[PDB]
Amino acid sequence: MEALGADVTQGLEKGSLITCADNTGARELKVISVHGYSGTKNRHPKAGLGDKITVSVTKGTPEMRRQVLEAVVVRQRKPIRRPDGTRVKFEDNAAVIVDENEDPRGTELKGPIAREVAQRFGSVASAATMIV
Amino acid sequence: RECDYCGTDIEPGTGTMFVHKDGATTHFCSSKCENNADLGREARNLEWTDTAR
Amino acid sequence: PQPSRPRKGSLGFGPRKRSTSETPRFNSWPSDDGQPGVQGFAGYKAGMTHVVLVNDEPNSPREGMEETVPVTVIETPPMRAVALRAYEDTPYGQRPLTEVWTDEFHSELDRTLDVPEDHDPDAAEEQIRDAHEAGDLGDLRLITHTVPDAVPSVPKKKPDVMETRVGGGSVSDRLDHALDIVEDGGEHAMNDIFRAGEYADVAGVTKGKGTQGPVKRWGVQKRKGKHARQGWRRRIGNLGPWNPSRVRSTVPQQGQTGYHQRTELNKRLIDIGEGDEPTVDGGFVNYGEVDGPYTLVKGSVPGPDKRLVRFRPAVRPNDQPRLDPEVRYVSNESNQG
RNA sequence: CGUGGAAGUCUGUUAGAGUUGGUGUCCUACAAUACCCUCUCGUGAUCUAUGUGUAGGGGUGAAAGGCCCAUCGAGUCCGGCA
RNA sequence: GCGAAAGCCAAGGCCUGUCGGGAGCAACCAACGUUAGGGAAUUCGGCAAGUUAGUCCCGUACCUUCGGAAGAAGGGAUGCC
RNA sequence: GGUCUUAAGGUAGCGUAGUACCUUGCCGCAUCAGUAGCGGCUUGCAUGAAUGGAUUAACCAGAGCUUCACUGUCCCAACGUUGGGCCCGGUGAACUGUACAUUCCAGUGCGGAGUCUGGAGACACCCAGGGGGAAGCAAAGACCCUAUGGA
RNA sequence: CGAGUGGCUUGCUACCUCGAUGUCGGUUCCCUCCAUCCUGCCCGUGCAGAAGCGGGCAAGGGUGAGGUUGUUCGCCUAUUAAAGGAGGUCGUGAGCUAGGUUUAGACCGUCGUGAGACAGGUCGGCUGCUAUCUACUGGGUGUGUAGGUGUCUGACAAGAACGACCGUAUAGUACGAGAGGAACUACGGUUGGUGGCCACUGGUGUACCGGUUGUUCGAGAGAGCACGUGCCGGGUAGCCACGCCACACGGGGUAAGAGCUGAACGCAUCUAAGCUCGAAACCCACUUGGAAAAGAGACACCGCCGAGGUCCCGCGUACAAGACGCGGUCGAUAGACUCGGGGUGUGCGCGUCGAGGUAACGAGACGUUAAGCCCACGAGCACUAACAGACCAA
Ligand SMILES: [Cl-]
Ligand SMILES: [Cl-]
Ligand SMILES: [K+]
Ligand SMILES: [Mg+2]
Ligand SMILES: [Mg+2]
Ligand SMILES: [Mg+2]
Ligand SMILES: [Mg+2]
Ligand SMILES: [Mg+2]
Ligand SMILES: [Mg+2]
Ligand SMILES: [Mg+2]
Ligand SMILES: [Mg+2]
Ligand SMILES: [Mg+2]
Ligand SMILES: [Mg+2]
Ligand SMILES: [Mg+2]
Ligand SMILES: [Mg+2]
Ligand SMILES: [Mg+2]
Ligand SMILES: [Mg+2]
Ligand SMILES: [Mg+2]
Ligand SMILES: [Mg+2]
Ligand SMILES: [Mg+2]
Ligand SMILES: [Mg+2]
Ligand SMILES: [Mg+2]
Ligand SMILES: [Mg+2]
Ligand SMILES: [Mg+2]
Ligand SMILES: [Mg+2]
Ligand code: NA
Ligand code: NA
Ligand code: NA
Ligand code: NA
Ligand code: NA
Ligand code: NA
Ligand code: NA
Ligand code: NA
Ligand code: NA
Ligand code: NA
Ligand code: NA
Ligand code: NA
Ligand code: NA
Ligand code: NA
Ligand code: NA
Ligand code: NA
Ligand code: NA
Ligand code: NA
Ligand code: NA
Ligand SMILES: [Sr+2]
Ligand SMILES: [Sr+2]
Ligand SMILES: [Sr+2]
Ligand SMILES: [Sr+2]
Ligand SMILES: [Sr+2]
Ligand SMILES: [Sr+2]
Ligand SMILES: [Sr+2]
Ligand SMILES: [Sr+2]
Ligand SMILES: [Sr+2]
Ligand SMILES: [Sr+2]
Ligand SMILES: [Sr+2]
Ligand SMILES: [Sr+2]
Ligand SMILES: [Sr+2]
Ligand SMILES: [Sr+2]
Ligand SMILES: [Sr+2]
Ligand SMILES: [Sr+2]
Ligand SMILES: [Sr+2]
Ligand SMILES: [Sr+2]
Ligand SMILES: [Sr+2]
Ligand SMILES: [Sr+2]
Ligand SMILES: [Sr+2]
Ligand SMILES: [Sr+2]
Ligand SMILES: [Sr+2]
Ligand SMILES: [Sr+2]
Ligand SMILES: [Sr+2]
Ligand SMILES: [Sr+2]
Ligand SMILES: [Sr+2]
Ligand SMILES: [Sr+2]
Ligand SMILES: [Sr+2]
Ligand SMILES: [Sr+2]
Ligand SMILES: [Sr+2]
Ligand SMILES: [Sr+2]
Ligand SMILES: [Sr+2]
Ligand SMILES: [Sr+2]
């Protein structure tokens, strides 16, 4: 993938419960796998800011619940490092549901987004209200 | 830059930036300030802080 | 069928024992490409600070922008190249032939060496030249020492002696370049060999940690779950199978950790200077105040503060040299806090 | 609404009795059955001291072939016996 | 303090649950404290650990042999002067 | 099959059961995924009425499963605390010992060798360690068979 | 249908062990095999491209996480370059686990007149030992080579020190009617492994500072105890990972394969002699060890009545003993003091305010006061202590 322009300490694991920052009808998401990832023995597969993840819908509307869809990690509680040395962290851990062509499933994105996620997934950027 | 809590000049290549739920941004110079802020204490009421004095 | 996993720790830095010399010894030297010159320098580790730098790489999207880079401050005062050793090409490899010394010796050199009183620098020089005519001359290296007295933070006054190779053009021209350095007093600085922005190889004897268990020493697991509460916490499963009926040296066991020689490759020299510019407020923790000739090495450097580290022009660089980087800010903030 | 104060009733390391898990500690032990935490019962078919009765193919047994002095699908001692 | 509870302290008893000295005192072990982000992914199994907690107020479902369930759950309060 | 054995020929119920071999039975619930658990179906290898059947409030250090909460169980380990461990003074056992013994790789041999054969390696002594081997030490195998054994 | 290889499955035999070689699965840690799953290089195609299918060389590296089940196996999910198999007493209990198997208790079904049985199911159910030898990981003492200090050499030894993926340009290009859609090369990053380091982020921090509950010292001040910090808040140094830095290219020789020249065999022929190429594989390159390499090494200087070393003393860049490193008055080695740099967060006392209360009294607020208290770091500073002095030695 295209360089994030930041060093990330993966804050999520397979089985982690995160917030769905969009109007799709999905409220809570469960991390299943991380695109392009291959671990090591005993290691819980890790997910972080800017990673495209396969997800499960835990809480939401009946039509959206129990569905296995792709998503992009948009926010995380564990700090990330910007080239200017500064660390950046969020209030919660969040993701935006995405389709085959990396375009958001919803129309409106709830809460802020990292500038690095914007550089990578353009159609998610030009759908965001606040970019930090 | 200047710390959004205590008010001292943050050393470049140091510090953390907290991004709130609404989108607000709070730059911190140290862990001490992050901790005092999470305790519900306001900078103006703490005598050691630059904002207070 | 039980998952695969790479073995715990590398077998290339073995045996994991205590180093013979605290002074690092290079086992390889750079090629003979450019003009004649000494292929290395030495200094004393001070501590760490960060620096703000302007991106030099043309392939980087962030070219021209401000980047925060970690740096190790190393006090590098001028050394003295007291002699020139010559090697001959014998059927058993390279063997030392003779040495050409000096008259100008540093006052505190008699703390390590038995200082020469009666020497013949002309007859020894002739011996090296007859060996060059015979076509049996191997390589030319300089016996060199440091001046720890010039460093106030380092307690030792006993000079650290080491050999360094002279590489360059032809064997005839570098023989003469070597003799010129020696004859004066052997005084040379970091500037003479290195330029800021160049990739150097840093060798050092690591931080001593005494005897440590397999977990810290080889990076093996701790006992997990229920196995952690039975009386075994940080001990490996088994020392080997039933057959072979012996313990292999490849199985992760306890012993000496640290105080081993390491040669860290491709270390970018951010800045070479002289002054109190890289010093930390209140002094570098467990070292002191820097006010003299220094070097700013990008990233980490093996060994603790006060330890003698060595420099060598990169034998295997990956990137092309981007000379004299623009340093916009050097942190002087206290390392305490 | 009050009174009343029942209970093989409840909570309880009250005293006391017991002994679920840790398969912890110990395992040439402090100990030939111990140590710690955890846990159960604790006005009753309760617990306990002393005195007293039942004896070996016999006792005793809310029954596990449990227990009858570190000895039990037939105690222990000596003898039959070399 | 509800208390023959905890914790602290008298009266009284003791330093005899009877070998000591030294190393910032390493590995390893027994007991134990704290660990960012994640939160049972560990394991046969949440085993181990943790969480909750005293008291008052409000409020309390299915089922029920009408005794019970029930401290259900859930919510708020709590110091000093 | 539309009586025959041997008297009758399984009624209420419950049912893939702590009983169901086939079996991870089929359908459903739940999960990303559920040989689990629960519900329904159920021809039940070989359920079933005091050899008691069924149902069940309450009770339980009884067995299985699910959710919320919590957390070093785990990702993946770190630092610290106390007693040991290590060195010194004093005290002072035991287990074990055919002999020899610095081994390693192959081979051979009653087919599972530190000791035999061929090679390789190997200067002696000591300290600390975790336990690979001595088919390690501890117990005249509990299993199996045997004895014109015992109870 | 015929010929074999292996010793992973099962069966057969009864050679070895019954004065015992602990047993399924799992776990942890190490080595290996190749019949290759991925990665490298190749041949063929029912090879346009892309994607495949089949075959060859090849064991360097990798081959992961999860749901049911004790399960091995397997079924299933999502990731992946791929999620290969097998050997090592079905590797591994003087390592672990006890879920299964495998006693003594009990239930159900079946069988039995019955005691009881079951190659059925089910709940419960114990795991000893202080290492003599050997083996390896690390640490010392001696002897050999035959005075000392310093610097080296390199016989040999170890390594995976690197493996793999994504993206960008190439390029919407080659190719193809279209749909679709490459590569050489150059770049940016990710992942796994590896070694090191602490400026930064993070953890710890029973140093330290503060708040505060119970009780005791009459109150106050200031303290002890509440498990080895009563609890809560913050936290320096250090140690750390969740933090940061570093880990090629290129040569040489080959395999499969592509060829050149070329004869036996006037031609032909990549082979018979000769030669050019060509794998992540081999060698070198690179890192680590390494004068005990018995051919027991080399160089330079000092010295044989004196070079050097040991003890002693003050200490750590070192450290379980031993070892190692530095300093020792011609000195900043350690401590004291003073600064600096840091931690906490505003001291005791006094003044004013203070809901009230006749007054007594009064939780608390402000000021004095970036105060008080504290520091495992630095600097200054010979003030105290590195004194005295012994020994070995060609
Ligand atoms: Cl996954
Ligand atoms: Cl384990
Ligand atoms: K046997
Ligand atoms: Mg596993
Ligand atoms: Mg710091
Ligand atoms: Mg800071
Ligand atoms: Mg009696
Ligand atoms: Mg019985
Ligand atoms: Mg945690
Ligand atoms: Mg698992
Ligand atoms: Mg528990
Ligand atoms: Mg069913
Ligand atoms: Mg054995
Ligand atoms: Mg026998
Ligand atoms: Mg029997
Ligand atoms: Mg009989
Ligand atoms: Mg092959
Ligand atoms: Mg291999
Ligand atoms: Mg098997
Ligand atoms: Mg086995
Ligand atoms: Mg074993
Ligand atoms: Mg055992
Ligand atoms: Mg044992
Ligand atoms: Mg079970
Ligand atoms: Mg059982
Ligand atoms: Na144990
Ligand atoms: Na009444
Ligand atoms: Na108990
Ligand atoms: Na009898
Ligand atoms: Na009971
Ligand atoms: Na812990
Ligand atoms: Na004996
Ligand atoms: Na052993
Ligand atoms: Na019997
Ligand atoms: Na065969
Ligand atoms: Na066989
Ligand atoms: Na065996
Ligand atoms: Na096993
Ligand atoms: Na391979
Ligand atoms: Na499974
Ligand atoms: Na075994
Ligand atoms: Na086992
Ligand atoms: Na065992
Ligand atoms: Na090649
Ligand atoms: Sr050298
Ligand atoms: Sr070398
Ligand atoms: Sr155990
Ligand atoms: Sr063997
Ligand atoms: Sr009662
Ligand atoms: Sr048990
Ligand atoms: Sr004990
Ligand atoms: Sr016992
Ligand atoms: Sr416990
Ligand atoms: Sr009770
Ligand atoms: Sr007799
Ligand atoms: Sr008293
Ligand atoms: Sr005594
Ligand atoms: Sr703390
Ligand atoms: Sr679970
Ligand atoms: Sr409540
Ligand atoms: Sr019927
Ligand atoms: Sr019943
Ligand atoms: Sr031991
Ligand atoms: Sr082969
Ligand atoms: Sr392939
Ligand atoms: Sr699970
Ligand atoms: Sr099966
Ligand atoms: Sr195995
Ligand atoms: Sr069992
Ligand atoms: Sr039974
Ligand atoms: Sr059975
Ligand atoms: Sr000899
Ligand atoms: Sr492309
Ligand atoms: Sr298109
Ligand atoms: Sr205390
Ligand atoms: Sr509490
Ligand atoms: Sr060929
Ligand atoms: Sr020698």
Curated annotation (Swiss-Prot), chain A:
CDD domains: Ribosomal_uL14. This is Large ribosomal subunit protein uL14. One of its GO terms (molecular function) is large ribosomal subunit rRNA binding. Belongs to the universal ribosomal protein uL14 family. SUPFAM superfamilies: Ribosomal protein L14. The L3/L14/L24e cluster may contact the 16S rRNA in 2 intersubunit bridges. Part of the 50S ribosomal subunit. Forms a cluster with proteins L3 and L24e. NCBIfam families: PRK08571.1, uL14_arch. Forms part of two intersubunit bridges in the 70S ribosome. Binds to 23S rRNA. The keyword ATP-binding does not apply. Gene3D superfamilies: Ribosomal protein L14. GO terms for cellular component: cytosolic large ribosomal subunit. Pfam families: Ribosomal_L14. InterPro entries: Ribosomal_uL14 (IPR000218), Ribosomal_uL14_arc (IPR019971), Ribosomal_uL14_CS (IPR019972), Ribosomal_uL14_sf (IPR036853). Keywords: Ribonucleoprotein, Ribosomal protein, RNA-binding, rRNA-binding. The keyword Ribonucleoprotein applies.
Curated annotation (Swiss-Prot), chain B:
GO terms for biological process: translation. A zinc finger (C4-type) spans 3-33. It comes from Haloarcula marismortui (strain ATCC 43049 / DSM 3752 / JCM 8966 / VKM B-1809). The chain holds residues 5 to 57 of 67 of the full protein. Binds to the 23S rRNA. This is Large ribosomal subunit protein eL24. Belongs to the eukaryotic ribosomal protein eL24 family. Zn(2+) binds at residues 3, 6, 29, 33. It comes from the Archaea. One of its GO terms (cellular component) is ribonucleoprotein complex. Part of the 50S ribosomal subunit. Forms a cluster with proteins L3 and L14. Keywords: Metal-binding, Ribonucleoprotein, Ribosomal protein, RNA-binding, rRNA-binding, Zinc, Zinc-finger.
UniProtKB/Swiss-Prot annotation, chain C:
GO terms for biological process: translation. InterPro entries: L3_arc_euk (IPR045077), Ribosomal_L3_dom_3_arc_sf (IPR044892), Ribosomal_uL3 (IPR000597), Ribosomal_uL3_arc (IPR019928), Ribosomal_uL3_CS (IPR019926), Transl_B-barrel_sf (IPR009000). It comes from the Archaea. Residues 219-236 have a biased composition (Basic residues). Keywords: Ribonucleoprotein, Ribosomal protein, RNA-binding, rRNA-binding. Residues 21-30, 246-258 have a biased composition (Polar residues). Residues 1-43, 150-169, 205-258, 311-337 are annotated as: Disordered. GO terms for molecular function: rRNA binding; structural constituent of ribosome. GO terms for cellular component: cytosolic large ribosomal subunit. Transmembrane segments: none annotated. Belongs to the universal ribosomal protein uL3 family. One of the primary rRNA binding proteins, it binds directly near the 3'-end of the 23S rRNA, where it nucleates assembly of the 50S subunit. Part of the 50S ribosomal subunit. Forms a cluster with proteins L14 and L24e. Interacts weakly with protein L13. PANTHER family: 60S RIBOSOMAL PROTEIN L3-RELATED, LARGE RIBOSOMAL SUBUNIT PROTEIN UL3. This is Large ribosomal subunit protein uL3. It comes from Haloarcula marismortui (strain ATCC 43049 / DSM 3752 / JCM 8966 / VKM B-1809) (Halobacterium marismortui).
